């Protein structure tokens, strides 16, 4: 009945069977297919959070709220128990990326900064950037509200001039939104998708963001189209993914929002309620 999660599982099956064995930039073995497309229903509250292995929902929500704040300080995420960016903000990683003058935790002008302060001069994580640069997130909300049929509703983190300053170049590269029949849909272009760890997290993240924007704009939700460039499995995840592929998906959970939420900046962890998410046991996959 959850045919959408079966699509994700079939993508993994296709990569394991047909993918090319390539060593990546780190020397890590991967199995890769270039160019994959899948569609997930977001209708009637549904968020595509995989049921065949637990997704780090606490991490998904806190990371997304941190992006929306325009925050690039890994420490602020770590303080909420979410460590997923900590390695990239470490004294070691900063020095190794030639960011020796940066304070620990400073990831540079990554997603949050690009979403809210696009084109502003980055001067470190501790600077207040209020009103500096282009607030893409507010601009796309204004387009959805005033010109819902627009073909120009794009949220991009791929700031070429800023790539050299970023801890990592964006994997979730741009998202396009569209309104049909008072339903908000999203097409996510992901240049690089780790099918084991990254992609399930990223699908949950853009599913949730589409619901949050729809809520602010008084719209229903439609679908999330997921476009992959390098759809890959790490060789060290193959046994774990073979275990997952034996499992039959359950129905995806739904999300609902509580409180008076007027703008994209008014969401809190407590305002977001995930309903009927009881996944199968987590499967450990190393970095």
Ligand X SMILES: O=c1ccn([C@H]2C[C@H](O)[C@@H](COP(=O)(O)O)O2)c(=O)[nH]1
Ligand Y SMILES: CN(Cc1cnc2nc(N)nc(N)c2n1)c1ccc(C(=O)N[C@@H](CCC(=O)O)C(=O)O)cc1
Q: Is 97 a catalytic residue?
A: no
Question: Burial of 151 by CB count in 10 Å (0-12 exposed, 13-18 middle, 19+ buried)?
Answer: exposed
Q: What does the buried/exposed string (b/e) look like for 39-69 if buried means 16 or more CB atoms within 10 Å of the residue's CB?
A: ebbbeebbbbbbbbbbbbbebbbbbbbbbbe
Provide DSSP, 238-278. HHHHHHHTTSPPPPPPEEEE-S---SGGG--GGGEEEES--
**Is 194 annotated as ligand-binding?**
yes
Q: Is 239 annotated as a binding residue?
A: no
Q: Which is nearer to ligand X, 166 or 184 (CB)?
A: 166
Site for ligand Y, residues 64 to 93, rule: CB under 6 A = 83-84
Task: List CB contacts of 55: < 8 A, sequence separation 6 or more.
Answer: 49, 200, 201, 204, 279
Q: Which of 4, 71, 162, 194 forms a contact with ligand X (CB under 6 A)?
A: 194
Cβ atoms of 59 and 77 within 8 Å: the answer is no
Nearer Cβ to ligand X, position 50 or 216?
50
Please choose, from the candidates 191, 247, 211, the residue with its C-alpha nearest in 3D space to the C-alpha of residue 40: 211
Contact stretch for ligand X (CB under 6 A) within 3-11, 36-44, 148-156, 186-194? 186-194
By CB under 6 A, residue 200 contacts ligand X: no
Select from 29, 198, 229, 279 the one that contacts ligand Y (CB under 6 A).
198
Q: With binding defined as CB under 6 A, does residue 202 bind ligand X?
A: yes
From 191, 188, 232, select the one nearest 207 (Cα to Cα).
Answer: 188
Structure tokens at 88: 């990239």
Which listed residue (56, 158, 189, 257) binds ligand Y by CB under 6 A?
Answer: 56
Of 45 and 244, CB closest to ligand Y: 244
Q: Does 197 bind ligand Y (CB under 6 A)?
A: yes
Residues 104 and 90: their CA atoms lie apart, in Å, by: 6
45 part of the interface to ligand X, by CB under 6 A? no
Among 25, 151, 246, 262, binds ligand X (CB under 6 A): 25
Interface residues with ligand X (CB under 6 A)? 25, 168-169, 171-172, 192-194, 198-199, 202
Catalytic residues: 171
Residues at the binding site for dUMP are 25, 191-192, 194, 202, 232, 234
Judged by the rule CB under 6 A, the positions of this chain that interact with ligand Y are 56, 59, 83-84, 194, 197-198, 201, 284-287
């Amino acid at each position: 009945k959850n045919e959408d999660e079966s699509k994700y599982l079939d993508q993994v099956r296709y990569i394991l069977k047909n993918g090319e064995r390539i060593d990546d930039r780190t020397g890590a073995g991967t199995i890769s297919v270039f160019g994959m497309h899948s569609v997930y229903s977001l209708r009637n509250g549904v968020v595509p959070v995989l049921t065949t292995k637990r997704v780090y929902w606490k991490g998904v929500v806190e990371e997304l709220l941190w992006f929306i704040r325009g925050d690039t300080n890994a420490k602020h995420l770590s303080e909420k128990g979410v460590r997923i960016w900590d390695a990239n903000g470490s004294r070691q990683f900063l020095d190794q990326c030639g960011f020796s003058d940066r304070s620990e935790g400073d990831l540079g002008p990554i997603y949050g900064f690009q979403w809210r302060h696009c084109g502003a001069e980055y001067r470190g994580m501790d600077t207040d950037y209020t009103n500096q640069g282009i607030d893409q997130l507010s601009e796309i909300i204004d387009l959805i509200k005033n010109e819902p049929h627009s073909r120009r509703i794009i949220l991009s983190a791929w700031n070429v001039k800023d790539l050299k300053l970023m801890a990592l170049p964006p994997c979730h590269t741009l998202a396009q939104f569209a309104v049909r029949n008072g339903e908000l849909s999203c097409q996510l272009y992901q240049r690089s998708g780790d099918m084991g760890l990254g992609v399930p997290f990223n699908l949950a993240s853009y599913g949730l963001l589409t619901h949050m924007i729809a809520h602010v704009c008084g719209l229903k939700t439609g679908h999330l189209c997921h476009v992959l460039g390098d759809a890959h499995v790490y060789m060290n995840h193959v046994d774990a993914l073979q275990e997952q592929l034996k499992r039959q998906p359950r129905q995806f959970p739904t999300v609902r929002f509580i409180g008076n939420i007027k703008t994209i900046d008014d969401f809190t962890y407590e305002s977001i309620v995930l309903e009927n998410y009881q996944p199968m046991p987590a499967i450990k996959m190393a970095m």
